[PDB]
Amino acid sequence: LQLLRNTRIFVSTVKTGHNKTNTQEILVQDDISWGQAAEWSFSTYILPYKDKNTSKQIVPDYMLWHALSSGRAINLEGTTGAHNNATNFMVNFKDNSYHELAMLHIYILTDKTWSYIDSCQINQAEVNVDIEDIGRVTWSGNGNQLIPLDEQPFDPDQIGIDDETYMTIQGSYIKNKLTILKIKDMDTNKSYDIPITGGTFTINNNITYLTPNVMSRVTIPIGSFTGAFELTGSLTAYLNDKSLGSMELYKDLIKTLKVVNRFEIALVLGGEYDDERPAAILVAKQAHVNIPTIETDDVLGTSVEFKAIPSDLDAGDEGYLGFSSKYTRTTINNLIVNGDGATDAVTAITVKSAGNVTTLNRSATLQMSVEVTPSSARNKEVTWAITAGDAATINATGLLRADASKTGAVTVEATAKDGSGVKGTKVITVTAGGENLYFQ
Amino acid sequence: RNTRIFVSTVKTGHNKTNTQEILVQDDISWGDSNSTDITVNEAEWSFSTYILPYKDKNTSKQIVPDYMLWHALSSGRAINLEGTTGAHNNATNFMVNFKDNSYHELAMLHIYILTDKTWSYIDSCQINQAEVNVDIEDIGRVTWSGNGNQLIPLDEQPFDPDQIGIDDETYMTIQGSYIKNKLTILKIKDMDTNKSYDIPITGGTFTINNNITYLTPNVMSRVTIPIGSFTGAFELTGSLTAYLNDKSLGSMELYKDLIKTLKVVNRFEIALVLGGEYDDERPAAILVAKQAHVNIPTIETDDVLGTSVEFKAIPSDLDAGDEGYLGFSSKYTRTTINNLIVNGDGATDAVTAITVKSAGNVTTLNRSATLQMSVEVTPSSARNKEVTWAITAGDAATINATGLLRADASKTTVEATAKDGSGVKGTKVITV
Ligand SMILES: [Cl-]
Ligand SMILES: [Cl-]
Ligand SMILES: [Cl-]
Ligand SMILES: [Cl-]
Ligand SMILES: [Cl-]
């Protein structure tokens, strides 16, 4: 028996001196449970919008995203935890190696009565990717204790969401009923866009609470400790020739999965388009992906299980998130490549030769160069290789040297150094040359 | 929490006939899920259960452990499982129809709540709505929503919950009664053409809504108003997601023919079969709507994500209460599902084949001579074996209401169609 009451939830980093910097209202759904270590749970939606004061992309529950991801104090202008800019609101786990993550106090106003949960830790965020309910997040955690309050700890109307912001938030839902699991083998650069109809992904901190009231002579400086950071997903896809685009894509994906288990993935809630639209993205640069029944095409769709893995034990790079009300294919690609929608990734490389010559005599040298698109790209540097032929070699600085005796076509390849995997090529043919050579 | 919910038609004299335990899935809210509106302006409950059909030990009849909710949703009369309306059953299936729902107030229930050794009850409840889940991974979940007059705490137990409630033997039977086959089929049929299609459903819901309006209480009437609420328009609708392509239906012919029929046909006889249909006895829950409006707008456009299917069941006439009906069983087959669709009961045999006969087996009717035509209807157990008579691809023959056949003036095939509603036909070719 759950009595449904008019409830308002607020989270704070403080117990006194509450203001709009350290406290925020949380727009919880009808499913909200708490009791008594105290345990709590509630849901919200990923609702990205333009903050009026800063003009930056934000979510109305950013303090929860921060507390899930970091042990430091909030700094939206930084590069870790919850952080943002005019292109997107971001979250990363690079600053999560702490016994205790950033502490929150959950204030509950219900039927003119106040209470609060003192000293909370956000253990888990489960994100829904069901096409009919995209971006629902179920938050769960614990608190040291639930305490009734005799009066208002602060003015909820002042501290809470104002009418103007509430209306903006209500129009910020990810409404496009589509999710795409983008999967890329970084060794071959083979990519696939898998439509997702069902499932969830979970960010779990595996927190262990210490049994309180166990008398210690010297106070134990933590009330709990984080466990292994786990970023996983259990999805359902509609995988076949039609859904991927062609029978060759589908056959190539089956071939790839037989020999490749590690991929760079991106789960795009709301899909990706060339015009500015809302989306929430989860990126895992090195994920273990399992699609066992790929060759079985059935009405239940196909199971896709993933486990994001860090590069090193405590790198905190298992994955990261990006949310915006105005994402595009371009800024989603930026997020996937660089970790930020605002940081331009390389999109195209045109290889050029000195004088636009397509031939080169034996023993001569030819300087190659690149025209990298877009010019706003963060890192425009390239690596140089010969991918076809043997009549020339190339320097690390793109100086092509024709062999002194060999002849033939060579394919010069420039590859982006920024993680995009973008390549550009030029064919140069080494020619014999008119030099009057003689037998000595 | 360890909450136990019971529903009853009475406030005293509780027994196993008038009271039953309800196996609620996860809490009963009391604020919730589209309940009643309140007229003459100057409370809501909600919980979920599963459709769990099983054989009752005492009667050997098919039943569900929440039959009193199905009865209260569908009827204003007292419960009578041996009847033909509301919640009713037999050895083949548990059924629900809406033929006895033309009442201001439907059958009242009292919801008793035992939670942490503390009792309370919601006095005088109306079931406004039942929303049934057709998601392949959670088939047959029902979300019930309604209103009551007030929630009242109780100082002592109103009855012994262990005697009134579900016993260990029945509980175990119920726990093995889930519709486990992850498949749903929306069977649609154009009754004019007899063209039928089995559309696989992967998601959605159907809703049975009573549109109840509660009267604002504590309103001074000189003569007491004898109702506290009134039912509105009975609405049976669904919003589904179908897997509709060349391979899902069975062939590209079927898919192309379904697109054709939808462009010119809006009204169909539909059956939503939760759990699928097979030739061996298996559990299933079926919703039938004999006169439904069906809309699949993106049938062509959609290729492989999912196709929206919206339907609205419509009665045959005013106050008929025949918008649709339900049938549940732990042992349904395609044969007894077909009986439910045709006759409203899995136990009532529908016609499956008709062989057209003559006086003997004579085909030599040459000119202006009378010949009595007859039928051999299969199965012999069919309830209604009556047939209508017509002339299909006929040159100069005449047919009456009975089986009499004659061709006048030496001018130079006969078809029997079941009255039953099955649409089964049989023919015979005559010489002339
Ligand atoms: Cl800090
Ligand atoms: Cl972090
Ligand atoms: Cl936390
Ligand atoms: Cl040249
Ligand atoms: Cl030369």
Author numbering:
A (entry chain A): 3 to 38, 67 to 470
B (entry chain B): 7 to 37, 39 to 49, 68 to 437, 441 to 460
What do the study authors state?
Phage T5 is a Siphoviridae infecting the Gram-negative host Escherichia coli. In T5, the tail tube is formed by the stack of 40 trimers of the TTP pb616 around the tape measure protein (TMP). Here, we determined the structure of pb6, and show that it results in the duplication/fusion of the hexamerisation domain common to all other tubes. Thus, T5 TTP is not an outlier in the family of TTPs, as it contains the same hexamerisation domain as other phages, T6SS and pyocin tube proteins, but results from a duplication/fusion: the unusual threefold symmetry of the tube is in fact pseudo-hexameric.
We have determined the pb6 monomer structure at 2.2 Å resolution. At first sight, the structure can be divided into two domains encompassing 374 and 85 residues. The C-terminal domain (residues 375–462) possesses an immunoglobulin-like (Ig-like) fold of the Big-2 family, confirming a previous sequence analysis. In λ, however, its absence has an influence on burst size and temperature sensitivity of the phage particle. For pb6, formation of tubes occurs even when this domain is absent (see below), and some T5-like TTP lack it. The common core shared by both subdomains consists of a β-sandwich flanked by an α-helix, and a long loop. This loop is not resolved in subdomain 1 (loop β3–β4), whereas it is stabilised by crystal contacts in subdomain 2 (loop β13–β14). However, both subdomains display high structural homology with TTPs of other sipho- and myophages, distal tail proteins of siphophages, T6SS tube proteins, the tube protein of R-pyocin, baseplate hub proteins from myophages and spike proteins from T6SS. The X-ray structure of the pb6 monomer fits remarkably well in the tube density (Chimera correlation 0.89 using a pb6 map simulated from atoms at a resolution of 6 Å, 879/6657 atoms being outside the contour), except for the N terminus, the long β13–β14 loop, loop β17–β18 and helix α5, all positioned at interfaces between monomers. Interestingly, these elements have a high temperature factor—i.e., are more flexible—in the crystal structure, and we could model them and loop β3–β4 in the unassigned EM densities observed in their vicinity, leading to a complete pseudo-atomic model of the T5 tail tube. In the tube assembly, a monomer is connected to six neighbouring subunits, making this structure very stable (pb6 tube melting temperature = 83 °C vs. 50 °C for pb6 monomer; note that it is 90 °C for purified tails).
